[PDB]
Amino acid sequence: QNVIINEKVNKKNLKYQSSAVPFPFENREQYERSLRMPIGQEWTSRASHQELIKPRIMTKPGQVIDPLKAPFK
Amino acid sequence: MKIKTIKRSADDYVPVKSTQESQMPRNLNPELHPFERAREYTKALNATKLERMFAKPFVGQLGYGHRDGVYAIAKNYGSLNKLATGSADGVIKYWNMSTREEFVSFKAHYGLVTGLCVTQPRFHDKKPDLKSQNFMLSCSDDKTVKLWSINVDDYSNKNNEEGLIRTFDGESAFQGIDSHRENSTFATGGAKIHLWDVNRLKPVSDLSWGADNITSLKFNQNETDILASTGSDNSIVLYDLRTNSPTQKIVQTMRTNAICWNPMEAFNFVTANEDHNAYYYDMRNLSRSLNVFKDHVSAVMDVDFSPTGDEIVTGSYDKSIRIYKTNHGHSREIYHTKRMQHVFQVKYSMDSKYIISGSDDGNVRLWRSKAWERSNVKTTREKNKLEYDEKLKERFRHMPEIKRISRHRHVPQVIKKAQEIKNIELSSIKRREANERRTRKDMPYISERKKQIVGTVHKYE
Amino acid sequence: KERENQNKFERSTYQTKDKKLRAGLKKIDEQYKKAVSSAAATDYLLPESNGYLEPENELEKTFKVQQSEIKSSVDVSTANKALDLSLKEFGPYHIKYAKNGTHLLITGRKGHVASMDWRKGQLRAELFLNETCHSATYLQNEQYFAVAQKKYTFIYDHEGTELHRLKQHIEARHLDFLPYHYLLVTAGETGWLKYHDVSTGQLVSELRTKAGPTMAMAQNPWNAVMHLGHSNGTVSLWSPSMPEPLVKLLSARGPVNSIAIDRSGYYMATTGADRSMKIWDIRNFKQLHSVESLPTPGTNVSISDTGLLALSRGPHVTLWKDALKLSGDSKPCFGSMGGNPHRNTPYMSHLFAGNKVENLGFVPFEDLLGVGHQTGITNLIVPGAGEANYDALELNPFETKKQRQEQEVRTLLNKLPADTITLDPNSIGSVDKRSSTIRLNAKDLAQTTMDANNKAKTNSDIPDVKPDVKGKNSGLRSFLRKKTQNVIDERKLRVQKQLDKEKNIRKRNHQIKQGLISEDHKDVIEEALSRFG
Amino acid sequence: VRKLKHHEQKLLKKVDFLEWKQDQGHRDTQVMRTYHIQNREDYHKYNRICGDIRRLANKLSLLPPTDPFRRKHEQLLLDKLYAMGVLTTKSKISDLENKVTVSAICRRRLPVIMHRLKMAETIQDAVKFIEQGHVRVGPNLINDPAYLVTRNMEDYVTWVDNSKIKKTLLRYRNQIDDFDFS
Amino acid sequence: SKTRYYLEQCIPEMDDLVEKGLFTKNEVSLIMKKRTDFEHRLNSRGSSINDYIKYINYESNVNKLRAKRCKRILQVKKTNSLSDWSIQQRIGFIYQRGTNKFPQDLKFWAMYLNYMKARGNQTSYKKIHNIYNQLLKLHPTNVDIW
RNA sequence: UUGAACAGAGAGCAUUUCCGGCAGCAGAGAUUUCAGCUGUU
């Protein structure tokens, strides 16, 4: 009537969009649930920004690393 | 009538002193930060392009290197600067890695050396200084195992005896050597597994599951009384030396060239195996390989776990060194140069970043575990930038452009062609097995984590 | 941890027996909601307040006050930004403020172009071009600014050094800029839209509007899309990737006169020379509400960043408050019958004496709107225009030169490519539309290949047989007629045979309906000679 | 805008805010500077005339060689250009294709002719003189500074009588003859 | 940056404070305006002990105000809520950063030591030990501090 | 490798102690605050 939407597919956006749901997820609903929150400093507070940017493995840099010892005591 | 527009204070924003830094106000509002997804995407692309910019892992070599070609390397578990290279001509060398130079060079035997270990001998006689001299155990080919002393200039509390603390003889040519580090018991591998202690010149005990030559062995770094030893009839054998009983055996499909444990889990281990592959086993159920690392072209030669329990380094008989994560099962990094041929040993340094690599040429080249993390200590803002970029990349992993860029690497030419040949083979094999599953009634799905096991000696329910 | 700002802060979106995935989801939910609440806590740190004009009587209105009383009543800084030029020599003037709110660009209709700081009264550049200059804008800073001309579009330096004659923007009429793609968008009197990248200096694309001369142009910032108003009565949203229009809209009769869009990307105001105005909901595309009888065609309207509406219809200028709300009371209206409070009075009015508003624009981060008319420039004081509390990582209205060059290099390194402009700003993140909703695996793909290689036996392709539905709309017959007559295929042999089968079963059901031989009549001769077939 | 450092340069190779691919060397500007002309439209219209001449020469090439149509027409065009002033040597029809430049037409312009005949001193000064109205072409003067002139009026360009210019000239030679009030 | 982090940590006590009846929103935002000016002038370069003292004096004043305000407005002399020792250990943390950025001025050192002696209910005997250790290792040639 | 005490650091862990809410007593700093005493919640 007085609204007309285009249906054609933007191929360059089809490059920029994903392949499928990738392996470590199960559902594209989960995939968007992960890609929901931007992580940038210009979108959350600084405290949560560090809290989201603190990586899993961390070392002190210049010290000898030791295999873990059992604390049975 | 109340009229009040915006008032601005110049002394609220642009401050007074001519040195005091300019103030920054914020407002976190999605109506005032428009292109969130596209901005983070382009930031991720800039991140991975900068990683390809700084992709320079190779960092140098060792002195002048040996004269024949490195066949064994041992890292000092006590320090960080110290390693020992056993050549193939017959000279052992102790290396300082702070300035990349030789401490000392000994003509140890006349034939080859087979294996090294660096350690702390707990004599019942007296305790040698663990800050003044470090002690090597070198296993030869001509029926010899010798314990050696090295003067190390780590400290300067002080300011003799330059070599050959003691010798040990046998009948056969030993192949492997290592040390149960509590009270300095050490296992040697020749014809049969012989367990020796230091002061007695004789083997304290002997074990063997069968009558096969045994080529490599290793104690686990934690739960430190368990021995794992391979066997030239494509076998893995476990021993519990607190019992002095050979614990378990499995027969594979190809000879397992090397083995090591992960010091962060202490009951798993990696086996570098001749069919071009690496295997990840648990200590309880040997029936399933917990994983298979599957990105080489020829005989693998050696592996080692990471002190961080996450990285596995492997060196092929092909002119290449691969590095894998524990998870993914396809090699993240690959190093190589035209100046090295047939790497035979690769080891980690005890601070989870630097890789010692002894190839057949005689040099010993060391590498960075990350192509990006410059070793230099960095300021806070830069540290935050690098970490923010890394988590952003790890998030935006599976977009196709980032996938192509980060996965795109350089390999040498013969190896690229040989990978594509093996790929063509695997595609044909897929077609054949698919037709077989069409035709026959019921062939059970034999998974790739178990397509390489022929059998255990002890079984389960 | 419930607050009042979560409604605005929350980013909108669309269970297993796998323990690692369960822990991952609970982890991400916990930290996401902590982060959103923390930003709602950052709410307190905003320095200032909004500007407001409140009556406090019922005898007094809002609009009855004027610039005289307001300039007398508010501070010396605002009364000093209350600019008032007088340029009587050259023709009517058009205005664009830079994005930082710190550099005014004025263009007369005859040749005058001036670029000034306007605040401490420095004068960067002045040029007396003779040819009719039509429109102008700063593009990225206060260092590069583009004017149109009669025919070819020019890029000038900060000083007035001529830098570019962009050939392929013929007869350009309305400029604008996309600051996050370095994109100069020109709408011509050719019906062509031209997107040009100023970074590499390359035309990214053209677009062909089959309407006619482009009447008016405006950009939606929160989507970075171009809105054109043509002559037919259409307003059309475009993006520089595809050569078809993204969407069209029949918003006015006669020609469109002006378009404007709120920063929140959720409200559009259009005005049309059939003395009409429309207030549009952009997303979902429902024209919300419509004023039908203005006593002049509206020249130019524009949105505030706080929710004011500015309407310019000749020698008048009016401003309305809270207009873009959805409820059926916020209809903008010139008068309230008997003090009817549900109707929406004008919020601030003004006339000019003998001019005609050529156009108008808000200042970004003060609260004034600037009017360009036939001989002078004026900057009316308005209480609630701009958000007082800006943000200093994108637009720093107080900008030292070192900070300028740093922000500029950073944005060059942080540009978007021109192809990521669509109707929805999370699609660049989300999955493909065509691919599966649930993640399938090697086993699933082997299974579907086996199913598609079993489909030749189990007839999976052609729709199956039901004698129940009428033969006109019968799916087999519609499939058969959708296929042509000249080539005959094995699938067509199959569909012919099953349509014969549907005819047989439906005729048996017709016999059992009309009342022929029924109740399990079994044809045992067919039974007895099915032995050989 | 920064002399931006190593890594950011190798990321931002292709950016340039000053010279683009499409403004080919700023050729128009450089010629405009060398001959002191006044409008971008003057340059581009001279471009169009040059372009049409070259399409003519191209189709004349595409004709077969030994047609008297081709020979007579190309020779007639060479007469037209050699009398016009744009191209110098009448014989190389290659130089019809390859020597025809907006530089050549713009040097056939008026003020360059003044600097040719050493009337004025430099070209900008010649433009000042023609704007101020001291120089006449034959019997009438010129005020539009962008006059084209062929050879047969190059013969008649001169300064106007009873100008202070001609007064200064004949005064220095000590030959002002104020019966003509020159 | 660091200013942002310190204000972020400063929020929740103010949140609890206006959540209880004793403060209102405009008072809150004005207080945070003063706080931003202080902390930003503390974390830029060019600051000094006079800036530190002015900040600590301001916070002591707001503690007195909150005392009298709560006392009047709900007759509860000490509410079981975060705010109180939050303000106090904010003061102590300001003292700490003050000595670390300037270990030189004995006057400021002395104000810190006198505040810690005065609030002897909630001090750590060990913390006064830590301060004396710091002071003696930095100045050992101060027999008066001995 | 163990057994005891000695000297503690204060850089770990649990309060299952009691206190950080009051009427009366006096000591102390330059009006106001740090600890104890009695009963109270």
Curated annotation (Swiss-Prot), chain B:
Start-end of Basic and acidic residues biased regions: 432-451
TM annotation in the entry: none
Keywords of the record: Nucleus, Repeat, Ribonucleoprotein, Ribosome biogenesis, rRNA processing, WD repeat
Which SMART domains does the record cross-reference, listed alphabetically?
WD40 (SM00320)
The extra comment attached to this record reads:
Present with 6620 molecules/cell in log phase SD medium.
Describe the function of this protein: Required for ribosomal RNA processing.
Q: What is this protein called?
A: Protein SOF1
Query: What is the species listed in this Swiss-Prot or TrEMBL entry?
Result: Saccharomyces cerevisiae (strain ATCC 204508 / S288c)
UniProtKB/Swiss-Prot annotation, chain C:
* Chief location of this protein within or outside the cell: nucleus
Region: Disordered; residue ranges are 454-475
Among the Pfam families in the record, one is BING4CT
Biased composition (Basic and acidic residues) is annotated at 1-11
Where does the UniProt annotation locate this protein?
Nucleus, Nucleolus
Please list which residues make up the signal peptide: none
Q: Where are the WD repeats?
A: 87-128, 209-248, 251-290, 293-330
Q: How does it assemble?
A: Interacts with snoRNA U3. Interacts with MPP10. Component of the ribosomal small subunit (SSU) processome composed of at least 40 protein subunits and snoRNA U3.
Name assigned to this protein:
U3 small nucleolar RNA-associated protein 7
Q: Which organism is it from?
A: Saccharomyces cerevisiae (strain ATCC 204508 / S288c) (Baker's yeast)
Curated annotation (Swiss-Prot), chain D:
Would you tell me the Gene Ontology cellular component terms?
90S preribosome; Mpp10 complex; nucleolus; nucleoplasm; small-subunit processome
State the PROSITE patterns in the record.
Answer: S4 (PS50889)
> What domain of life does the UniProt record list for this protein's source?
Eukaryota
Report domain S4 RNA-binding positions. 108-174
Q: InterPro entries from the xrefs?
A: Ribosomal_uS4, Ribosomal_uS4_N, S4_RNA-bd, S4_RNA-bd_sf
A single GO molecular function term of this UniProt record = rRNA binding
GO annotation, biological process: maturation of SSU-rRNA; ribosomal small subunit biogenesis; rRNA processing
Matching entries from Pfam families are given as: Ribosomal_S4 (PF00163), S4 (PF01479)
UniProt keyword list: Nucleus, Ribonucleoprotein, Ribosome biogenesis, RNA-binding, rRNA processing, rRNA-binding
Tell me the protein family, please: Belongs to the universal ribosomal protein uS4 family.
Write out the function statement from the record.
Answer: Required for the early cleavages at sites A0, A1 and A2 during 18S ribosomal pre-RNA processing.
Question: What is the name listed in the Swiss-Prot or TrEMBL entry for this protein?
Answer: U3 small nucleolar ribonucleoprotein protein IMP3
The organism of origin for this protein: Saccharomyces cerevisiae (strain ATCC 204508 / S288c)
Q: What is the lineage of its organism?
A: Eukaryota, Fungi, Dikarya, Ascomycota, Saccharomycotina
Swiss-Prot record, chain E:
- Per the UniProt record, which residue ranges are transmembrane? none
Superkingdom, taxonomy of origin: Eukaryota
HAT repeat locations: 86-118, 123-146
Q: Where in the cell is it found?
A: Nucleus, Nucleolus
Record-stated family? Belongs to the UTP6 family.
Q: What else is known?
A: Present with 7520 molecules/cell in log phase SD medium.
Quote the function comment for this protein.
Answer: Component of the SSU processome, a pre-ribosomal particle required for the maturation of the 18S rRNA from the 35S pre-rRNA precursor.
Summarize subunit and interaction data from the UniProt record for this chain: Component of the ribosomal small subunit (SSU) processome, or 90S pre-ribosomal particle, composed of the 35S pre-rRNA precursor, the U3 snoRNA, and at least 40 protein subunits. Component of the PWP2/UTP-B subcomplex composed of DIP2, PWP2, UTP6, UTP13, UTP18 and UTP21. Interacts with U3 snoRNA. Interacts with MPP10.
**Protein name, per record:** U3 small nucleolar RNA-associated protein 6
Q: Which organism was this protein described from?
A: Saccharomyces cerevisiae (strain ATCC 204508 / S288c) (Baker's yeast)
Q: Gene for this protein?
A: UTP6
Covered residues, full protein = 2 to 147 of 440
